[model samples]
Target: GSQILCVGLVVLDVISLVDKYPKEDSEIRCLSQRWQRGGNASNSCTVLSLLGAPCAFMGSMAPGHVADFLVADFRRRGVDVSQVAWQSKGDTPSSCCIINNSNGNRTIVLHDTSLPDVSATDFEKVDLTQFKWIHIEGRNASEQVKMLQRIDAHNTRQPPEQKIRVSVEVEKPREELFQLFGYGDVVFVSKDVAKHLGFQSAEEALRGLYGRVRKGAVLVCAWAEEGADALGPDGKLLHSDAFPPPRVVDTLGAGDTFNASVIFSLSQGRSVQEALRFGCQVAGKKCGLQGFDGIV
Candidate 1:
Protein backbone atom coordinates (compact mmCIF):
# COMPACT_ATOMS: atom_id res chain seq x y z
CA GLY A 1 0.00 0.00 0.00
CA SER A 2 1.09 3.58 -0.61
CA GLN A 3 1.15 6.56 1.72
CA ILE A 4 -2.07 7.83 3.26
CA LEU A 5 -2.45 11.64 3.25
CA CYS A 6 -4.30 13.34 6.12
CA VAL A 7 -5.40 17.00 6.03
CA GLY A 8 -6.91 18.89 8.98
CA LEU A 9 -6.11 20.74 12.21
CA VAL A 10 -2.94 19.87 14.12
CA VAL A 11 -2.30 21.45 17.52
CA LEU A 12 -0.49 21.01 20.82
CA ASP A 13 -2.82 19.41 23.38
CA VAL A 14 -2.55 19.98 27.12
CA ILE A 15 -4.26 17.15 28.94
CA SER A 16 -5.09 17.35 32.64
CA LEU A 17 -6.56 15.16 35.35
CA VAL A 18 -9.38 16.25 37.63
CA ASP A 19 -11.99 14.61 39.81
CA LYS A 20 -14.81 16.92 38.66
CA TYR A 21 -15.42 19.93 36.46
CA PRO A 22 -15.75 23.41 37.94
CA LYS A 23 -19.13 25.08 37.70
CA GLU A 24 -19.62 28.81 37.04
CA ASP A 25 -15.89 29.53 37.04
CA SER A 26 -15.28 27.85 40.35
CA GLU A 27 -11.73 26.64 41.00
CA ILE A 28 -10.89 22.98 40.62
CA ARG A 29 -8.01 20.66 41.53
CA CYS A 30 -6.20 17.88 39.68
CA LEU A 31 -4.36 14.71 40.70
CA SER A 32 -2.03 13.50 37.94
CA GLN A 33 -0.74 14.39 34.44
CA ARG A 34 -0.29 12.83 31.05
CA TRP A 35 0.84 14.48 27.79
CA GLN A 36 0.87 13.36 24.20
CA ARG A 37 -0.05 14.37 20.68
CA GLY A 38 -3.66 15.42 20.00
CA GLY A 39 -5.68 16.66 17.00
CA ASN A 40 -7.93 15.08 14.42
CA ALA A 41 -5.57 14.77 11.47
CA SER A 42 -2.43 14.65 13.60
CA ASN A 43 -3.68 11.77 15.72
CA SER A 44 -4.97 9.93 12.65
CA CYS A 45 -1.63 10.20 10.92
CA THR A 46 0.11 9.19 14.13
CA VAL A 47 -1.96 6.03 14.28
CA LEU A 48 -1.26 5.30 10.64
CA SER A 49 2.45 5.69 11.22
CA LEU A 50 2.21 3.49 14.33
CA LEU A 51 0.30 0.93 12.27
CA GLY A 52 3.16 0.98 9.76
CA ALA A 53 1.50 2.94 6.98
CA PRO A 54 3.45 5.51 5.01
CA CYS A 55 1.54 8.64 6.01
CA ALA A 56 1.87 12.38 5.51
CA PHE A 57 0.04 14.62 7.96
CA MET A 58 -0.64 17.93 6.22
CA GLY A 59 -1.75 20.70 8.52
CA SER A 60 -0.59 23.85 10.34
CA MET A 61 1.47 24.37 13.42
CA ALA A 62 2.02 27.89 14.72
CA PRO A 63 5.32 29.58 14.03
CA GLY A 64 6.63 29.49 17.58
CA HIS A 65 8.58 27.44 20.09
CA VAL A 66 5.47 25.69 21.35
CA ALA A 67 4.84 24.05 17.99
CA ASP A 68 8.34 22.60 18.01
CA PHE A 69 7.18 19.86 20.31
CA LEU A 70 4.51 18.78 17.84
CA VAL A 71 6.85 18.93 14.87
CA ALA A 72 9.51 16.98 16.73
CA ASP A 73 6.97 14.50 18.02
CA PHE A 74 5.60 13.74 14.56
CA ARG A 75 9.07 13.39 13.12
CA ARG A 76 10.20 11.17 15.98
CA ARG A 77 7.29 8.85 15.31
CA GLY A 78 8.18 8.57 11.60
CA VAL A 79 5.28 10.55 10.18
CA ASP A 80 5.76 12.83 7.19
CA VAL A 81 4.85 16.44 7.87
CA SER A 82 6.80 18.03 5.07
CA GLN A 83 3.63 19.10 3.30
CA VAL A 84 2.40 21.14 6.27
CA ALA A 85 2.80 24.93 6.46
CA TRP A 86 3.92 26.31 9.81
CA GLN A 87 2.17 29.64 10.05
CA SER A 88 2.35 32.97 12.02
CA LYS A 89 3.11 33.16 15.71
CA GLY A 90 -0.29 34.29 16.82
CA ASP A 91 -2.58 32.45 19.20
CA THR A 92 -1.22 29.04 20.12
CA PRO A 93 -3.50 26.13 19.30
CA SER A 94 -4.06 23.83 22.23
CA SER A 95 -6.85 21.95 23.99
CA CYS A 96 -7.70 21.32 27.64
CA CYS A 97 -9.03 17.82 28.11
CA ILE A 98 -10.27 17.17 31.63
CA ILE A 99 -10.55 13.44 32.23
CA ASN A 100 -13.50 12.50 34.42
CA ASN A 101 -12.37 9.13 35.71
CA SER A 102 -15.74 8.43 37.27
CA ASN A 103 -17.98 8.03 34.19
CA GLY A 104 -15.38 7.17 31.56
CA ASN A 105 -15.97 10.48 29.81
CA ARG A 106 -14.07 13.75 29.61
CA THR A 107 -14.77 17.40 28.83
CA ILE A 108 -12.62 18.74 26.04
CA VAL A 109 -12.10 22.49 26.14
CA LEU A 110 -10.17 23.85 23.20
CA HIS A 111 -9.18 27.22 21.82
CA ASP A 112 -7.52 28.79 18.77
CA THR A 113 -8.28 28.14 15.10
CA SER A 114 -4.89 29.32 13.93
CA LEU A 115 -3.84 26.44 11.79
CA PRO A 116 -2.85 27.15 8.21
CA ASP A 117 -5.38 26.46 5.50
CA VAL A 118 -4.96 23.65 2.96
CA SER A 119 -5.47 24.63 -0.61
CA ALA A 120 -4.48 23.46 -4.05
CA THR A 121 -1.51 25.79 -3.63
CA ASP A 122 -0.35 23.91 -0.55
CA PHE A 123 -0.24 20.75 -2.62
CA GLU A 124 0.83 22.56 -5.78
CA LYS A 125 4.47 21.53 -5.70
CA VAL A 126 3.77 17.86 -5.05
CA ASP A 127 1.80 15.32 -7.00
CA LEU A 128 -1.29 13.84 -5.41
CA THR A 129 -0.51 10.72 -7.41
CA GLN A 130 2.10 9.77 -4.83
CA PHE A 131 -0.47 8.84 -2.23
CA LYS A 132 -2.95 5.96 -2.31
CA TRP A 133 -5.42 7.27 0.26
CA ILE A 134 -6.47 10.81 1.20
CA HIS A 135 -8.30 11.38 4.49
CA ILE A 136 -9.84 14.56 5.89
CA GLU A 137 -11.03 15.30 9.44
CA GLY A 138 -13.31 18.19 8.37
CA ARG A 139 -11.55 21.20 9.87
CA ASN A 140 -11.54 23.50 6.85
CA ALA A 141 -14.74 22.69 5.01
CA SER A 142 -14.21 25.29 2.30
CA GLU A 143 -10.69 24.14 1.55
CA GLN A 144 -11.81 20.54 1.55
CA VAL A 145 -14.58 21.44 -0.88
CA LYS A 146 -12.06 23.15 -3.09
CA MET A 147 -9.72 20.21 -2.82
CA LEU A 148 -12.61 17.96 -3.75
CA GLN A 149 -13.38 20.20 -6.70
CA ARG A 150 -9.77 19.85 -7.76
CA ILE A 151 -10.12 16.10 -7.39
CA ASP A 152 -13.24 16.22 -9.49
CA ALA A 153 -11.43 18.14 -12.15
CA HIS A 154 -8.38 15.93 -11.94
CA ASN A 155 -10.50 12.84 -12.52
CA THR A 156 -11.33 14.00 -16.07
CA ARG A 157 -7.74 14.67 -17.08
CA GLN A 158 -5.52 12.59 -14.81
CA PRO A 159 -4.66 8.93 -15.12
CA PRO A 160 -6.10 6.33 -12.81
CA GLU A 161 -2.90 5.99 -10.79
CA GLN A 162 -3.03 9.70 -10.14
CA LYS A 163 -6.49 9.31 -8.69
CA ILE A 164 -6.76 9.11 -4.88
CA ARG A 165 -9.32 7.40 -2.71
CA VAL A 166 -10.78 10.22 -0.59
CA SER A 167 -12.45 9.79 2.80
CA VAL A 168 -14.11 12.39 5.03
CA GLU A 169 -14.45 11.94 8.80
CA VAL A 170 -16.70 14.27 10.73
CA GLU A 171 -18.18 14.21 14.24
CA LYS A 172 -20.64 17.05 13.92
CA PRO A 173 -23.22 17.63 11.18
CA ARG A 174 -23.09 20.65 8.97
CA GLU A 175 -25.79 21.68 6.53
CA GLU A 176 -24.97 21.01 2.87
CA LEU A 177 -21.78 19.22 3.82
CA PHE A 178 -22.78 16.79 1.13
CA GLN A 179 -21.50 19.42 -1.29
CA LEU A 180 -18.11 17.75 -1.07
CA PHE A 181 -19.66 14.35 -1.60
CA GLY A 182 -18.82 14.50 -5.27
CA TYR A 183 -15.13 14.22 -4.43
CA GLY A 184 -15.11 11.50 -1.79
CA ASP A 185 -14.80 7.75 -2.17
CA VAL A 186 -15.81 7.39 1.45
CA VAL A 187 -17.62 9.50 4.06
CA PHE A 188 -16.92 8.62 7.70
CA VAL A 189 -19.64 9.98 9.95
CA SER A 190 -20.27 9.58 13.66
CA LYS A 191 -23.60 8.60 15.19
CA ASP A 192 -23.78 12.10 16.62
CA VAL A 193 -23.38 13.60 13.16
CA ALA A 194 -25.82 11.04 11.69
CA LYS A 195 -28.55 11.93 14.14
CA HIS A 196 -28.47 15.59 13.14
CA LEU A 197 -28.81 14.76 9.45
CA GLY A 198 -32.49 13.67 9.71
CA PHE A 199 -32.71 10.01 10.67
CA GLN A 200 -35.09 9.32 13.57
CA SER A 201 -33.26 6.07 14.34
CA ALA A 202 -29.69 4.88 13.83
CA GLU A 203 -30.75 2.31 11.24
CA GLU A 204 -32.88 4.90 9.54
CA ALA A 205 -30.01 7.35 9.53
CA LEU A 206 -27.71 4.91 7.78
CA ARG A 207 -30.42 4.06 5.29
CA GLY A 208 -31.20 7.69 4.66
CA LEU A 209 -27.56 8.61 4.07
CA TYR A 210 -27.13 5.62 1.80
CA GLY A 211 -29.90 7.03 -0.35
CA ARG A 212 -28.66 10.61 -0.70
CA VAL A 213 -24.87 10.51 -0.26
CA ARG A 214 -22.27 10.67 -3.01
CA LYS A 215 -23.09 8.13 -5.67
CA GLY A 216 -19.99 5.91 -5.48
CA ALA A 217 -18.73 6.58 -1.97
CA VAL A 218 -19.11 4.46 1.17
CA LEU A 219 -20.59 6.00 4.35
CA VAL A 220 -19.26 4.70 7.68
CA CYS A 221 -21.20 5.75 10.75
CA ALA A 222 -19.61 5.16 14.16
CA TRP A 223 -22.25 4.29 16.73
CA ALA A 224 -21.50 4.57 20.42
CA GLU A 225 -21.41 1.22 22.28
CA GLU A 226 -23.12 -0.33 19.24
CA GLY A 227 -19.82 0.02 17.35
CA ALA A 228 -19.76 1.15 13.71
CA ASP A 229 -21.32 0.15 10.39
CA ALA A 230 -20.11 0.57 6.84
CA LEU A 231 -22.66 1.13 4.08
CA GLY A 232 -21.33 -0.26 0.86
CA PRO A 233 -21.99 0.87 -2.69
CA ASP A 234 -24.83 -1.61 -3.01
CA GLY A 235 -26.51 -0.30 0.18
CA LYS A 236 -25.27 -3.36 2.03
CA LEU A 237 -24.46 -2.66 5.67
CA LEU A 238 -21.58 -4.21 7.63
CA HIS A 239 -21.38 -3.63 11.37
CA SER A 240 -19.12 -4.33 14.38
CA ASP A 241 -19.27 -3.94 18.14
CA ALA A 242 -16.52 -2.59 20.35
CA PHE A 243 -13.94 -5.16 21.46
CA PRO A 244 -14.52 -4.53 25.14
CA PRO A 245 -11.60 -4.22 27.52
CA PRO A 246 -11.58 -5.40 31.16
CA ARG A 247 -13.39 -2.17 32.04
CA VAL A 248 -14.15 1.28 30.66
CA VAL A 249 -11.95 4.11 31.93
CA ASP A 250 -12.15 7.05 29.56
CA THR A 251 -13.80 7.22 26.14
CA LEU A 252 -12.28 10.41 24.75
CA GLY A 253 -10.40 9.29 21.66
CA ALA A 254 -11.97 5.89 21.11
CA GLY A 255 -13.70 7.02 17.94
CA ASP A 256 -10.60 8.77 16.67
CA THR A 257 -8.54 5.66 17.32
CA PHE A 258 -11.20 3.57 15.65
CA ASN A 259 -11.16 5.78 12.58
CA ALA A 260 -7.39 5.86 12.44
CA SER A 261 -7.08 2.10 12.90
CA VAL A 262 -9.62 1.36 10.22
CA ILE A 263 -7.86 3.65 7.80
CA PHE A 264 -4.56 2.08 8.74
CA SER A 265 -5.90 -1.46 8.32
CA LEU A 266 -7.46 -0.60 5.00
CA SER A 267 -4.23 1.06 3.94
CA GLN A 268 -2.42 -2.14 4.95
CA GLY A 269 -4.63 -4.27 2.65
CA ARG A 270 -6.94 -5.80 5.25
CA SER A 271 -10.58 -6.60 4.49
CA VAL A 272 -13.16 -4.06 5.69
CA GLN A 273 -14.37 -6.34 8.50
CA GLU A 274 -10.82 -6.94 9.59
CA ALA A 275 -10.18 -3.23 9.57
CA LEU A 276 -13.19 -2.64 11.79
CA ARG A 277 -12.05 -5.27 14.25
CA PHE A 278 -8.55 -3.83 14.25
CA GLY A 279 -10.01 -0.44 15.10
CA CYS A 280 -11.99 -2.00 17.95
CA GLN A 281 -8.90 -3.65 19.32
CA VAL A 282 -6.89 -0.44 19.31
CA ALA A 283 -9.72 1.57 20.87
CA GLY A 284 -10.30 -1.10 23.52
CA LYS A 285 -6.62 -0.93 24.35
CA LYS A 286 -6.80 2.86 24.41
CA CYS A 287 -9.41 2.97 27.19
CA GLY A 288 -7.17 0.99 29.48
CA LEU A 289 -4.65 3.79 29.41
CA GLN A 290 -5.21 7.26 30.83
CA GLY A 291 -4.70 9.84 28.09
CA PHE A 292 -4.96 10.41 24.33
CA ASP A 293 -1.37 9.34 23.76
CA GLY A 294 -1.90 6.24 25.88
CA ILE A 295 -3.11 4.41 22.79
CA VAL A 296 -0.03 5.41 20.90
Candidate 2:
Protein backbone atom coordinates (compact mmCIF):
# COMPACT_ATOMS: atom_id res chain seq x y z
CA GLY A 1 0.00 0.00 0.00
CA SER A 2 1.33 3.42 -0.98
CA GLN A 3 -0.65 5.34 1.61
CA ILE A 4 0.47 8.01 4.10
CA LEU A 5 -1.42 8.44 7.37
CA CYS A 6 -1.20 11.47 9.69
CA VAL A 7 -2.19 11.00 13.30
CA GLY A 8 -2.81 13.99 15.55
CA LEU A 9 -5.01 17.00 16.45
CA VAL A 10 -7.24 19.29 14.40
CA VAL A 11 -8.66 22.70 15.22
CA LEU A 12 -10.99 25.06 13.43
CA ASP A 13 -9.03 28.29 12.96
CA VAL A 14 -10.80 31.65 13.08
CA ILE A 15 -8.27 33.92 11.39
CA SER A 16 -8.60 37.69 11.71
CA LEU A 17 -6.22 39.73 9.60
CA VAL A 18 -5.02 42.93 11.24
CA ASP A 19 -2.47 45.60 10.37
CA LYS A 20 -0.44 45.13 13.53
CA TYR A 21 -0.27 42.67 16.41
CA PRO A 22 -2.94 44.22 18.64
CA LYS A 23 -3.63 46.90 21.27
CA GLU A 24 -5.10 46.05 24.67
CA ASP A 25 -8.92 46.26 24.77
CA SER A 26 -9.13 48.09 21.48
CA GLU A 27 -11.96 47.44 19.00
CA ILE A 28 -9.83 47.45 15.87
CA ARG A 29 -11.43 45.19 13.28
CA CYS A 30 -10.50 46.70 9.93
CA LEU A 31 -9.39 43.73 7.85
CA SER A 32 -10.98 40.55 6.51
CA GLN A 33 -11.82 37.66 8.81
CA ARG A 34 -12.26 34.03 7.89
CA TRP A 35 -11.87 30.49 9.19
CA GLN A 36 -9.90 27.46 7.98
CA ARG A 37 -8.82 24.02 9.13
CA GLY A 38 -5.57 24.17 11.10
CA GLY A 39 -3.40 21.73 13.02
CA ASN A 40 0.02 20.16 12.54
CA ALA A 41 -1.21 16.74 11.52
CA SER A 42 -4.21 18.13 9.69
CA ASN A 43 -2.15 20.60 7.70
CA SER A 44 0.49 18.09 6.64
CA CYS A 45 -2.09 15.67 5.30
CA THR A 46 -3.63 18.41 3.19
CA VAL A 47 -0.26 19.35 1.76
CA LEU A 48 0.51 15.74 1.09
CA SER A 49 -2.82 15.31 -0.64
CA LEU A 50 -2.22 18.47 -2.65
CA LEU A 51 1.13 17.05 -3.67
CA GLY A 52 -0.91 14.16 -5.15
CA ALA A 53 -0.07 11.53 -2.54
CA PRO A 54 -2.59 9.00 -1.28
CA CYS A 55 -3.00 9.97 2.39
CA ALA A 56 -5.34 9.77 5.36
CA PHE A 57 -5.83 11.66 8.66
CA MET A 58 -6.82 10.12 11.99
CA GLY A 59 -8.09 12.16 14.96
CA SER A 60 -11.14 13.04 17.05
CA MET A 61 -13.55 15.88 16.37
CA ALA A 62 -17.01 17.04 17.43
CA PRO A 63 -19.68 16.51 14.83
CA GLY A 64 -22.56 18.60 13.40
CA HIS A 65 -21.08 22.03 14.17
CA VAL A 66 -18.26 24.26 12.94
CA ALA A 67 -16.04 21.21 13.03
CA ASP A 68 -18.16 19.75 10.25
CA PHE A 69 -16.55 22.29 7.95
CA LEU A 70 -13.13 20.81 8.70
CA VAL A 71 -14.30 17.39 7.60
CA ALA A 72 -15.67 18.70 4.32
CA ASP A 73 -12.47 20.67 3.73
CA PHE A 74 -10.38 17.56 4.18
CA ARG A 75 -12.33 15.68 1.54
CA ARG A 76 -12.16 18.72 -0.75
CA ARG A 77 -8.39 18.53 -0.56
CA GLY A 78 -8.63 14.76 -1.12
CA VAL A 79 -7.31 13.86 2.33
CA ASP A 80 -8.89 10.68 3.67
CA VAL A 81 -11.16 11.20 6.70
CA SER A 82 -12.48 7.65 7.04
CA GLN A 83 -10.70 7.15 10.36
CA VAL A 84 -11.98 10.23 12.21
CA ALA A 85 -13.37 9.60 15.69
CA TRP A 86 -16.47 11.77 15.83
CA GLN A 87 -17.67 12.38 19.36
CA SER A 88 -21.40 12.40 19.95
CA LYS A 89 -21.31 15.13 22.60
CA GLY A 90 -18.63 17.84 22.67
CA ASP A 91 -17.59 21.10 21.10
CA THR A 92 -14.87 21.10 18.49
CA PRO A 93 -11.39 22.39 19.30
CA SER A 94 -10.81 25.92 18.07
CA SER A 95 -8.00 28.46 17.62
CA CYS A 96 -8.44 32.19 17.33
CA CYS A 97 -5.61 33.36 15.08
CA ILE A 98 -4.79 37.03 14.73
CA ILE A 99 -2.46 37.51 11.79
CA ASN A 100 -0.58 40.72 11.15
CA ASN A 101 -0.78 41.37 7.42
CA SER A 102 2.26 43.62 7.58
CA ASN A 103 4.63 40.71 8.04
CA GLY A 104 2.46 37.57 8.04
CA ASN A 105 3.02 37.16 11.78
CA ARG A 106 0.33 35.31 13.71
CA THR A 107 -0.56 34.90 17.39
CA ILE A 108 -2.99 32.14 18.36
CA VAL A 109 -4.94 31.12 21.45
CA LEU A 110 -6.37 27.57 21.53
CA HIS A 111 -9.59 26.21 23.00
CA ASP A 112 -9.25 22.41 23.01
CA THR A 113 -10.58 21.18 26.32
CA SER A 114 -13.61 19.68 24.63
CA LEU A 115 -12.77 16.50 22.71
CA PRO A 116 -10.21 14.02 23.97
CA ASP A 117 -7.37 13.01 21.69
CA VAL A 118 -7.27 9.67 19.88
CA SER A 119 -5.86 6.83 21.95
CA ALA A 120 -3.92 3.58 21.68
CA THR A 121 -7.31 1.83 21.58
CA ASP A 122 -8.07 3.68 18.37
CA PHE A 123 -4.59 3.06 16.98
CA GLU A 124 -4.95 -0.66 17.55
CA LYS A 125 -7.97 -0.85 15.26
CA VAL A 126 -6.29 0.64 12.22
CA ASP A 127 -4.58 -1.91 9.97
CA LEU A 128 -0.89 -1.04 10.01
CA THR A 129 -0.20 -2.75 6.69
CA GLN A 130 -2.28 -0.19 4.76
CA PHE A 131 0.16 2.70 5.00
CA LYS A 132 3.68 3.08 3.70
CA TRP A 133 4.45 6.06 5.94
CA ILE A 134 2.91 6.96 9.29
CA HIS A 135 3.50 10.57 10.41
CA ILE A 136 2.53 11.40 13.97
CA GLU A 137 1.96 14.84 15.46
CA GLY A 138 3.95 15.32 18.68
CA ARG A 139 1.34 17.31 20.65
CA ASN A 140 -0.29 14.56 22.71
CA ALA A 141 3.07 13.09 23.62
CA SER A 142 2.15 10.38 26.14
CA GLU A 143 -0.67 8.70 24.25
CA GLN A 144 1.17 9.27 20.98
CA VAL A 145 4.09 7.20 22.19
CA LYS A 146 1.70 4.31 22.77
CA MET A 147 0.50 4.71 19.21
CA LEU A 148 4.12 4.69 18.09
CA GLN A 149 4.71 1.58 20.15
CA ARG A 150 1.79 -0.05 18.38
CA ILE A 151 3.61 0.55 15.11
CA ASP A 152 6.70 -1.01 16.62
CA ALA A 153 4.61 -3.96 17.72
CA HIS A 154 3.26 -4.41 14.22
CA ASN A 155 6.70 -4.07 12.64
CA THR A 156 8.00 -6.83 14.88
CA ARG A 157 5.59 -9.28 13.25
CA GLN A 158 6.08 -8.26 9.64
CA PRO A 159 8.86 -8.98 7.23
CA PRO A 160 11.17 -6.19 5.99
CA GLU A 161 9.28 -5.68 2.71
CA GLN A 162 5.98 -5.17 4.51
CA LYS A 163 7.28 -3.00 7.35
CA ILE A 164 5.95 0.56 7.70
CA ARG A 165 7.95 3.77 7.74
CA VAL A 166 7.50 5.76 10.96
CA SER A 167 7.79 9.51 11.15
CA VAL A 168 7.35 11.83 14.13
CA GLU A 169 7.17 15.61 14.36
CA VAL A 170 8.93 17.07 17.42
CA GLU A 171 8.19 20.75 17.00
CA LYS A 172 8.20 21.58 20.71
CA PRO A 173 10.98 21.38 23.28
CA ARG A 174 8.97 19.71 26.04
CA GLU A 175 10.91 17.27 28.21
CA GLU A 176 8.31 14.55 27.78
CA LEU A 177 8.25 14.90 24.01
CA PHE A 178 11.92 13.98 23.93
CA GLN A 179 10.88 10.32 24.11
CA LEU A 180 9.29 10.69 20.67
CA PHE A 181 12.62 11.69 19.15
CA GLY A 182 14.19 8.25 19.27
CA TYR A 183 11.28 6.40 17.66
CA GLY A 184 11.02 7.74 14.12
CA ASP A 185 12.66 6.38 11.01
CA VAL A 186 12.35 10.02 9.95
CA VAL A 187 12.21 12.74 12.64
CA PHE A 188 11.40 16.36 11.95
CA VAL A 189 12.51 18.93 14.54
CA SER A 190 11.63 22.60 14.48
CA LYS A 191 14.11 25.44 14.89
CA ASP A 192 12.93 26.21 18.44
CA VAL A 193 13.51 22.62 19.49
CA ALA A 194 16.99 22.73 17.99
CA LYS A 195 17.79 26.07 19.65
CA HIS A 196 16.57 24.75 23.00
CA LEU A 197 19.09 21.93 22.57
CA GLY A 198 21.81 24.59 21.97
CA PHE A 199 21.94 24.19 18.20
CA GLN A 200 22.24 27.67 16.71
CA SER A 201 21.93 26.61 13.06
CA ALA A 202 20.15 23.94 11.05
CA GLU A 203 23.45 22.31 10.13
CA GLU A 204 24.65 22.32 13.73
CA ALA A 205 21.39 20.84 14.95
CA LEU A 206 21.66 17.80 12.65
CA ARG A 207 25.35 17.32 13.37
CA GLY A 208 25.00 17.65 17.15
CA LEU A 209 21.70 15.83 17.64
CA TYR A 210 22.39 12.98 15.22
CA GLY A 211 23.35 10.68 18.06
CA ARG A 212 19.93 10.98 19.67
CA VAL A 213 18.09 9.36 16.72
CA ARG A 214 17.30 5.70 16.05
CA LYS A 215 20.11 3.85 14.41
CA GLY A 216 19.35 4.08 10.66
CA ALA A 217 17.03 7.04 11.08
CA VAL A 218 17.13 10.23 9.06
CA LEU A 219 16.80 13.39 11.16
CA VAL A 220 15.80 16.70 9.61
CA CYS A 221 15.72 20.21 11.09
CA ALA A 222 13.92 23.02 9.28
CA TRP A 223 14.69 26.66 10.07
CA ALA A 224 12.56 29.48 8.67
CA GLU A 225 14.03 31.50 5.74
CA GLU A 226 17.40 29.75 6.22
CA GLY A 227 16.21 26.56 4.51
CA ALA A 228 16.48 23.06 6.02
CA ASP A 229 19.27 20.65 6.95
CA ALA A 230 19.20 16.87 7.18
CA LEU A 231 21.49 14.18 8.58
CA GLY A 232 21.07 10.84 6.85
CA PRO A 233 21.89 7.40 8.30
CA ASP A 234 25.31 7.86 6.69
CA GLY A 235 26.14 10.56 9.28
CA LYS A 236 26.64 13.38 6.80
CA LEU A 237 25.12 16.85 6.77
CA LEU A 238 23.18 18.13 3.73
CA HIS A 239 21.85 21.68 3.49
CA SER A 240 19.48 23.48 1.14
CA ASP A 241 19.25 27.27 0.75
CA ALA A 242 15.91 28.86 1.58
CA PHE A 243 13.74 29.36 -1.47
CA PRO A 244 11.85 32.51 -0.52
CA PRO A 245 9.16 34.18 -2.56
CA PRO A 246 9.68 37.74 -3.76
CA ARG A 247 7.44 38.68 -0.82
CA VAL A 248 6.02 36.42 1.82
CA VAL A 249 2.22 36.15 1.87
CA ASP A 250 1.85 33.55 4.56
CA THR A 251 4.18 32.23 7.28
CA LEU A 252 1.94 30.36 9.67
CA GLY A 253 1.98 27.05 7.76
CA ALA A 254 5.55 27.20 6.47
CA GLY A 255 6.94 24.52 8.75
CA ASP A 256 4.34 21.89 7.84
CA THR A 257 4.75 22.53 4.12
CA PHE A 258 8.45 21.75 4.24
CA ASN A 259 7.92 18.60 6.23
CA ALA A 260 5.12 17.42 3.97
CA SER A 261 7.19 18.01 0.86
CA VAL A 262 10.21 16.28 2.31
CA ILE A 263 8.14 13.29 3.38
CA PHE A 264 6.44 13.14 0.01
CA SER A 265 9.74 13.54 -1.81
CA LEU A 266 11.42 10.82 0.16
CA SER A 267 8.43 8.51 -0.20
CA GLN A 268 8.74 8.88 -3.97
CA GLY A 269 12.28 7.48 -3.71
CA ARG A 270 14.00 10.83 -4.29
CA SER A 271 17.44 11.57 -2.90
CA VAL A 272 17.71 13.18 0.54
CA GLN A 273 19.56 16.14 -0.98
CA GLU A 274 16.76 16.67 -3.49
CA ALA A 275 14.17 16.20 -0.79
CA LEU A 276 15.69 19.07 1.20
CA ARG A 277 15.69 21.41 -1.76
CA PHE A 278 12.20 20.36 -2.88
CA GLY A 279 10.84 20.93 0.61
CA CYS A 280 12.35 24.42 0.71
CA GLN A 281 10.92 25.13 -2.73
CA VAL A 282 7.44 23.93 -1.78
CA ALA A 283 7.48 25.90 1.49
CA GLY A 284 8.71 29.03 -0.27
CA LYS A 285 5.94 28.67 -2.83
CA LYS A 286 3.39 28.40 -0.01
CA CYS A 287 4.62 31.68 1.52
CA GLY A 288 4.00 33.43 -1.77
CA LEU A 289 0.34 32.49 -1.92
CA GLN A 290 -2.53 33.17 0.47
CA GLY A 291 -3.35 29.46 0.85
CA PHE A 292 -1.71 26.38 -0.62
CA ASP A 293 -2.57 26.53 -4.33
CA GLY A 294 -0.36 25.33 -7.17
CA ILE A 295 2.33 24.54 -4.58
CA VAL A 296 3.30 21.22 -6.16
Candidate 1 clashing pairs?
none
TM-score of each: 0.89, 0.95
Model 1, range 54-169, lDDT digits (tens) per residue? 88988766666667778888898788888877666555578888776665676778887654566667755556767888888776677678777666676668677566678888
Single out the weakest 10-residue window by summed lDDT for candidate 2: 287-296
Please state every model's RMSD to the true fold in angstroms.
Answer: 2.5, 1.5
lDDT for residue 149 in candidate 2, whole number 0-100? 86
**Model 1 misplaced stretches (Cα beyond 4 Å):** 21-25, 113-116, 152-162, 292-296
Task: Tell me the tens digit of each residue's lDDT in model 2 across 53-74.
Answer: 9999998988776776898899
Clash pairs (backbone) in predicted model 2: none
At residue 213, what lDDT does model 2 achieve? 88
